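Handout for the seminar on molecular recognition.
Each group receives one record of this type.
Step one: identify the two inputs.
Step two: read the structure output and locate the region that could contact 2-acetamido-2-deoxy-beta-D-glucopyranose.
Step three: write two sentences on what you found, then compare them with the reference statements printed after the record.
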Amino acid sequence: QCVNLTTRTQLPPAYTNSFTRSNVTWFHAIHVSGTNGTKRFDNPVLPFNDGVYFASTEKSNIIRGWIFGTTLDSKQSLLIVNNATNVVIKVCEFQFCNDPFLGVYYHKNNKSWMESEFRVYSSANNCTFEYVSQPFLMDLEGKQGNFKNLREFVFKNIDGYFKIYSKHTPINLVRDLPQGLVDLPIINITRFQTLLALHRSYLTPGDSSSGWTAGAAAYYVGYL
Amino acid sequence: VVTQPPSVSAAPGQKVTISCSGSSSNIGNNYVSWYQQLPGTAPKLLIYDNNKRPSGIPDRFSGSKSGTSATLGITGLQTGDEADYYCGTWDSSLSAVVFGGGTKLTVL
Amino acid sequence: QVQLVQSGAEVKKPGASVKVSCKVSGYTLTELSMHWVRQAPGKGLEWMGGFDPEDGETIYAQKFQGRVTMTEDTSTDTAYMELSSLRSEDTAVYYCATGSPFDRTQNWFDPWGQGTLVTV
Ligand SMILES: *[C@@H]1O[C@H](CO)[C@@H](O)[C@H](O)[C@H]1NC(C)=O
Ligand SMILES: *[C@@H]1O[C@H](CO)[C@@H](O)[C@H](O)[C@H]1NC(C)=O
Ligand SMILES: *[C@@H]1O[C@H](CO)[C@@H](O)[C@H](O)[C@H]1NC(C)=O
Ligand SMILES: *[C@@H]1O[C@H](CO)[C@@H](O)[C@H](O)[C@H]1NC(C)=O
Ligand SMILES: *[C@@H]1O[C@H](CO)[C@@H](O)[C@H](O)[C@H]1NC(C)=O
């Protein structure tokens, strides 16, 4: 499939001080403005030189894994996807397309939702790896209200080993700038990109456009 | 079952009202919708939920439900477009979705 | 934006049976309901049957029940319907309609097909 969703719009890159969590970037994936119909989508690829610091905040999560590689085409690439029940980490010779995303849709006679991964990749020829364990992310808590929870990660690739880190802490101040796991013996990495989750329905009539939609999402990035 | 006066007529630029009627169970405890039938072509939805137009082409229309009677109309009619119109909904008692007989709009 | 296309015209002799096929594009059949409607020449529309979101089944009109049958296949993404015991007065155009798949009990048919004609 691989429908096209990108939009001509571009915005000047914002930046903020790290404040000892620097010249950290700041991106907006789904952006809304006064003109209520302005839904925009853009997930550019970013360099991966030595290491990356990742953080985000979400009301109801739409963030599922990442993709890493050098060519990002059928000509290898590490892929991660995480869902509500279990995480899966796989190394495979995937064939991606310009606008990868994870789609979900209704199932009329089974009274449940289902997720289709074929919107991300087309071919997985002669492919081996697979892993399973408890999920990295989680979207439930014993409290709901004004305060939110903040996530963070660190990736480094030294001596051939691949390693991950993560911590969870809630905020106590009003909304502002940032307050102030496994080891996989996997490849040459120089780029990566995050992938979102989108959902569709048919309740409304005469929707002469693509039905993919979701809420607003943002995240931070930095280098070592 | 339902009834509807056939073959209404009007002059261009004037108001026009179309009346569709039913019983307590046929049209009472449900919504309605209105379709038009250009000759030699499949119908095309126009109104749903008794007052809501779909996005895009549909022009401004209205509908009120006086218990078991509903009406549709347009402030001004034109010869640019004109065809048959139909009413129909889901009967709630010992019946399924049914359609009315239709009325052949006439423009001088 | 769903676009529907179906088989071409058909002819038949008295007493036989015929099948009509309707296809979809864009969306997939597993998240849409299907309905069938017929109109005699100049006599107005008439409802044949369809899928009821209230429960998982297929219900037919009270008048014609037993004379028809419906089936679906998702691999090719095409819906099927059959008609039998054709008689003298049976002749009309046949339309393939779709609508909301998960409303409690709602009726807003859209869109429709280009139409097929069956002679008897
Ligand atoms: C999406 O845009 C790219 C731009 O290079 C184009 O090659 C591709 O054909 C487009 N997708 C479709 C479905 O046309
Ligand atoms: C880093 O600081 C420079 C200072 O001139 C600024 O131009 C640049 O935009 C900053 N980085 C980002 C990602 O904005
Ligand atoms: C989540 O991912 C696992 C990994 O294999 C898969 O088995 C499962 O079907 C996916 N979906 C749900 C709802 O668990
Ligand atoms: C149907 O739903 C049940 C639970 O409601 C689930 O266990 C089963 O896997 C579903 N089957 C299909 C084919 O979706
Ligand atoms: C795996 O490689 C072999 C080469 O011997 C080839 O025959 C086979 O089709 C490949 N499998 C896939 C899924 O591409």
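Reference statements: Residues 15 and 86 of chain C are 5 Å apart (CA to CA). The radius of gyration of chain C is 14 Å.
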